[PDB]
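Q: Predict the bound structure with magnesium ion.
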Amino acid sequence: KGIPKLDDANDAGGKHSLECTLILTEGDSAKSLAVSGLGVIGRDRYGVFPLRGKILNVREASHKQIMENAEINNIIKIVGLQYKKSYDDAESLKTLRYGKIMIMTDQDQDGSHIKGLLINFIHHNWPSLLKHGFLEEFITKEAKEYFADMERHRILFRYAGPEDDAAITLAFSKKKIDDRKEWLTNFMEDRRQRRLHKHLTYNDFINKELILFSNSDNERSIPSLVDGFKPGQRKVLFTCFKRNDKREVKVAQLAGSVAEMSAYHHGEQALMMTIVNLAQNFVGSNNINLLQPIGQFGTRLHGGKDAASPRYIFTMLSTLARLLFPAVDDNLLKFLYDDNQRVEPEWYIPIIPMVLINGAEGIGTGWACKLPNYDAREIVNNVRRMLDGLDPHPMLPNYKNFKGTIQELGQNQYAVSGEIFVVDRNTVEITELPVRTWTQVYKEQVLEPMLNGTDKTPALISDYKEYHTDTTVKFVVKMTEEKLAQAEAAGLHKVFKLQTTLTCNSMVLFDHMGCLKKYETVQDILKEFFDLRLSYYGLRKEWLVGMLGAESTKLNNQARFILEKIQGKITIENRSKKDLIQMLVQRGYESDPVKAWKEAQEGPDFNYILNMSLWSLTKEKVEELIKQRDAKGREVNDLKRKSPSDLWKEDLAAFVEELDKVESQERED
Amino acid sequence: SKIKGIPKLDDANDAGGKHSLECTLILTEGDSAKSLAVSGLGVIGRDRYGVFPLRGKILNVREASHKQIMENAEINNIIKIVGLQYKKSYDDAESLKTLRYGKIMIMTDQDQDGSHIKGLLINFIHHNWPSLLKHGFLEEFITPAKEAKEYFADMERHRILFRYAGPEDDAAITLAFSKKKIDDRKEWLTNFMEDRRQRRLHGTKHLTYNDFINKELILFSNSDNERSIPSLVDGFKPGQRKVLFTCFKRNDKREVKVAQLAGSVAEMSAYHHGEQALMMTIVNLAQNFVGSNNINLLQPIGQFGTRLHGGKDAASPRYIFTMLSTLARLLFPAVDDNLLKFLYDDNQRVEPEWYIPIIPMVLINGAEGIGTGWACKLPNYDAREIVNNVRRMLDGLDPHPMLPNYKNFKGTIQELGQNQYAVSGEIFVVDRNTVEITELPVRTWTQVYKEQVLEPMLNGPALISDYKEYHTDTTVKFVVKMTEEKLAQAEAAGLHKVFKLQTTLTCNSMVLFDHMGCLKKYETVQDILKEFFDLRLSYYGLRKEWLVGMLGAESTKLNNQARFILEKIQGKITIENRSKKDLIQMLVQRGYESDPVKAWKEAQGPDFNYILNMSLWSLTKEKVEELIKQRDAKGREVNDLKRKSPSDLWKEDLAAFVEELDKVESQERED
DNA sequence: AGCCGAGC
DNA sequence: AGCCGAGC
Ligand SMILES: COc1cc([C@@H]2c3cc4c(cc3[C@@H](O[C@@H]3O[C@@H]5CO[C@@H](C)O[C@H]5[C@H](O)[C@H]3O)[C@H]3COC(=O)[C@H]23)OCO4)cc(OC)c1O
Ligand SMILES: COc1cc([C@@H]2c3cc4c(cc3[C@@H](O[C@@H]3O[C@@H]5CO[C@@H](C)O[C@H]5[C@H](O)[C@H]3O)[C@H]3COC(=O)[C@H]23)OCO4)cc(OC)c1O
Ligand SMILES: [Mg+2]
Ligand SMILES: [Mg+2]
Ligand SMILES: [Mg+2]
Ligand SMILES: [Mg+2]
Ligand SMILES: [Mg+2]
Ligand SMILES: [Mg+2]
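A: Predicted complex:
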């Protein structure tokens, strides 16, 4: 009583309390479906309360965050549970307003994660209730049909023994991370083997059901080594490539298009945030943003948190996008299917390892991935050295427009330093902040405590002024001569918090086979990317030789028919379709060689000839068609004398050319 | 003096101290406008300038209830920020010592709704503290992140001060915002619309409140009518029309998310307002429950709302889908698009001034709106009755009177007199101790009736012993228990009266734009029907003219294509190896005609592309015979149309419409 | 204690 | 004391 989103069972709290079931639903929308499904009679023995999504994991969570969590407090007040209270006996259960909790979620993996978080919540606080069969689930005007069928949709969770304890702990305990790695490692291996060849116990729920979320969590959160993308990001670029927008599109509108075209199965709000992240160009985000930030996508001041609503902002492809992901290689990719609809590919195959450029980052279950940004030109140069058979030079992380320094301290560990300089004996100037330190955060958490002091720290500076621009940082700080001499003695970057450590010891990617792998150096990422991209330039040459040759044979037959027609060697006039096709066969014309070639990759068709306009017989069109035919034959031969390496070099040169123009234009604006 | 309770406020550093009267409080339209202001001020402006966002339209405090005023958080926020006190006079300089700011600078969009917000703020100060306006308390900041810092560095040229000249300023503010001035606003806007039409037949740091009201706010009041009051012709307001124009253009064969459609509408139709209002309009166009639309032109695929909550239970526009009803293009035939006047927004072609439906859609769906000085309310009418009346008028007979009719409504609508109706639900005695309610009067929602009628009957003297609910999504069933004596007493009085199942409906404001865009008051729906009929019959005449011309052009085009094909296959003509110029000149000398369809369109060198673009297939046997058939069919089709009257084509459209109306409505009842 | 981001 | 709906 007093909880606005709760519809309380009429008998809750009275003599029938333990015969009452509380339905916890995923979202308010599921509560309404459950409310209408219960009808009038269901209000006596059933309550309904909505969940806001993922529940707090209370196992290792701090006491402050637990007691301040409103959703869990609501559940506790609704059910009437008491912390630290043992439910072992029958007299103790008279404390409860509800005898059973029924979790009702989507039938998908994220629903399974909420089930497990609720199971985890009860298992941690009152293990004794689960041995009574406290928890059950509901599986799915269509709702009224479910609740009349209720026993068929009702599954009861059973606690069979200590294997149920270990399973819950395996999933939700901070101390089990390494066990989750093994747990999921053994899971992915068995699927590779299988792919190439009522009551529910908590152990079964966790190992047969929740693990599907845990694996799906990694697949959505951990990028591919090949293109550097997660599937949601890859869906975005696939949609933009297919749309080929010449003008800016509202982010919210592009997101809805992505869901339709790529079969994105999650909430669009998440897609909109991904699109925003793909377009951000501020210092510390994307070395090359593949989407253009037209409107306010956020700045280094707030670290992108100041981005405006996706309803007010627009985007389109960067001109660099199709240069890094050439459209011709789409013919080599493997495009996935979602229920008979062809969708985004397994991965794109960019011309450089984009996974290094923009700093792929993500958090899964059992594993996370963090890579810093690397310099596009430096990577191009290493690809060129490798094409010559030379070893690649080592690479330090490099952030576009970052004015500070990044120094290797050790393997995969770096010091990132901003800029500070003594101006006079009273004055220092801060012209850069370490990568991912945001201007407003630095002001509030560093300079303000330095100016005002805190309860635990003395004042240091006597004043500061802010000269920043939208992309740049300038602080001018005043200090007494004494304080500045002390600051120099301890070192200026240290005192002013301008140095941060960058450690990347989890570089975890899916390889080109879709296998999760840990990479110890970026050189190993570069090498694995290089061997794959080189063979795909081989595949591209094979594809171009075939398609260009088919196009050549096509133009040859078209030109031959036109010449024989204008010379009177052949007439189609007033001839039946059958007679014309038969005659074209007897004279040796080929069925459409492009359609034939395109179908070979997986009656005679002369339409490519007979669909030609009557203009084709005129003088200037005859001459134009002969030129096109001869041009295509020269095109075939020009391609055949290029190696895969030459083709790669052409793409690299064209990309660098545009990268210089684009980044030069950026500094102008 | 400090304010700790208003998180969205950025207080001037000197506000509340000795320099208070030298400080400005910038009120912005919305939070993003505040960020533009806070950015434009920068480090320097923080001392003498505060910024606080307004949430949109401000409470109109003139003649508002004391409760609504005291409970209004936005106004209480403004009062607390500035330090104002109700009932206090600010006259002498001593009285100003209690103010944390000496001036308020309003910063809104440079559009009409921004002007409305300016007026509401002016209204708020004028009503409570007229003395403050004599001191020059109010100012505005006009516009046409880096742009913001440019605006504020030039603030002198963007700053305009409101001036109180005298009693005509009071009259102007009262004329705009007083509930007793409705008649004066009608005259105010009548003169405006008239004087503007006359000009269409032909070719300062300070601003007085009188000039603000009469030259600026009046533009919002007029735009408020133009957006809120429907057109007699199609029954649409402009935003609804832009939706239908977009849907016709897209021609979706599959459902579309309403949020996605709204963004598509904004781009395609140049809709200038918030997309959330467009999404609500889209939801409102698709609702089929009892009491909303007799014919919904968009399909409700999702939860669009029910009669339980009166549509307020619609799910989020992000979660629901729509598309055209199959009736939409039958009511608005695509061929008549050629007769419409399409508007332009900055060289982009957008929705027409109105569609011309085959029946008066303004009577079908109950056109409704609230403007300034006028509102419009029409009930729903029955589509087949309207079709029959149109047929009666085509035959020169008199149209039957029409009572309001709501689809699937099981109750009774009785005419008390002209434009006056008693609308009754259904209640029936089952036995002694039991009555049953199977229908509620139109636009009485099931949950509201339970809460406001049956619940007070059950508890607060209690007239009934109990009730139970058998409703479905689309239907209403209440079974009510009471003592014999109480039922007899309730039955002695009206059962419909006791249970509040009768509502009166009066439509004395039927206010629409006529076909010229002139605001008109219509006394009867027969008047509406007759005015629509004359214009629509005229446009069936235009459609026939348009079709005769276009079909005739198409026939000439085919005659030339067939002639060329026949001469080619007979050897009478050869294009082989001939130059383009020689072939153009030769076709001209032989009397082939330049593209007849293009020539006809341009009428509303020679172009033989429509001939020479034909495929080589055209010279084969089957395509020759096909082309000749197509040519003769086209000639017959132009001849068949010439014989028909505009009335015959209207009858054809009505029959096709009714046939699909029958199929669609049958399928609705089976589902 | 809190960020990073694709999810609820 | 509030609905209707196109707007902020
Ligand atoms: C209130 O009703 C429900 C809420 C939810 C949660 C939720 C829960 C919250 C909360 C916020 C949210 C919100 O997340 C926010 O979305 C924002 C959308 O714009 C982008 C820019 O930034 C996002 C925020 O980063 C994110 O935090 C929802 C978005 O979609 C969800 O699943 C989220 O603050 C308080 O608790 C689930 C439900 O059922 C499944 C519900 O019925
Ligand atoms: C908080 O930030 C601002 C809010 C606003 C108002 C507003 C104001 C409100 C309020 C709500 C709203 C909200 O209206 C609601 O939108 C809903 C959108 O979906 C449909 C289904 O139903 C709509 C509601 O019928 C409507 O009531 C806004 C939507 O667009 C506006 O202009 C509205 O509740 C409290 O006061 C203006 C601003 O600056 C211009 C702001 O910065
Ligand atoms: Mg789901
Ligand atoms: Mg943690
Ligand atoms: Mg990144
Ligand atoms: Mg505006
Ligand atoms: Mg009122
Ligand atoms: Mg209506």
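A: The interface with chain B takes residues 29, 40, 141, 250, 252-253, 256-257, 260, 268, 296, 308, 311-312, 465-466, 470, 565-566, 568, 572-577, 580, 609-620, 622 of chain A (CB under 8 Å).
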